[PDB]
Design a binder for this molecule. Structure first.
Ligand SMILES: N#CC1=C(c2cc(Cl)cc(Cl)c2)C(=O)N2CCC[C@]12Cc1ccc(C#N)cc1
Length: 180
């Protein structure tokens, strides 16, 4: 499983303390589970601006999820998802940062609300994109469909809607079952 995976997580002011922590814990749990594989990880927090919490080359050093995300500061601003995706496509998937030319590129977007910006995201066309929409903001079909534009096709497979943050645990279990 030679995959270069980037977690692009929402750090807007809409996330309460425990909700942000559950997002961080989900990323850590996934990384820990896939530590003995060819997976390589990078994580970017997005709100109004974007910040690479750790790059692929950082992950490779000791593969310590707890340590890699210990200094994360909850941004608590807006939700500029479109710009965040372009940021990942142009500033994170770079060989200079540890990305592997022959690895399959995957982007996991985790958010709890609609984007506060707009923009072309063709820069991420060679990236497999999943989006995890969490919470009441996505309780209606209409709101859920706004996430389709960020994900790969078909949305039925790349868009994951979770009613609560506790469901991240359920999602993780569901994902693990697929690789046997
Ligand atoms: N579906 C799915 C997949 C992934 C994915 C990961 C995260 Cl963190 C969240 C979400 Cl929404 C999707 C993922 O990275 N890959 C690589 C290609 C498709 C797959 C395949 C797969 C690999 C490993 C596991 C595990 N464990 C399960 C499935």
């Amino acid at each position: 499983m030679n995959v270069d995976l980037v977690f692009l997580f929402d750090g807007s002011m809409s996330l309460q303390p425990d909700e942000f922590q559950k997002i961080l814990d989900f990323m850590k749990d996934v990384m820990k589970k896939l530590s003995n594989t060819s997976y390589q990880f990078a994580a970017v927090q997005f709100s109004t601006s974007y910040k690479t919490e750790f790059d692929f080359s950082d992950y490779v050093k000791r593969k310590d999820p707890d340590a890699l995300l210990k200094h994360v500061k909850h941004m608590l601003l807006l939700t500029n998802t479109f710009g965040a995706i372009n940021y990942v496509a142009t500033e994170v998937f770079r060989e200079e940062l540890g990305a592997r030319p022959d690895a399959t590129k995957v982007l996991i977007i985790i958010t709890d609300g609609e984007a506060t910006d707009s923009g072309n995201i063709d820069a991420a066309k060679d990236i497999i994109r999943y989006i995890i929409g969490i919470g009441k903001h996505f309780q209606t079909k209409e709101s859920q469909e706004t996430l389709h534009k960020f994900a790969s096709k078909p949305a039925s497979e790349f868009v994951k809607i979770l009613d609560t943050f506790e469901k991240l645990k359920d999602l993780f279990t569901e994902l693990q079952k697929k690789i046997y």
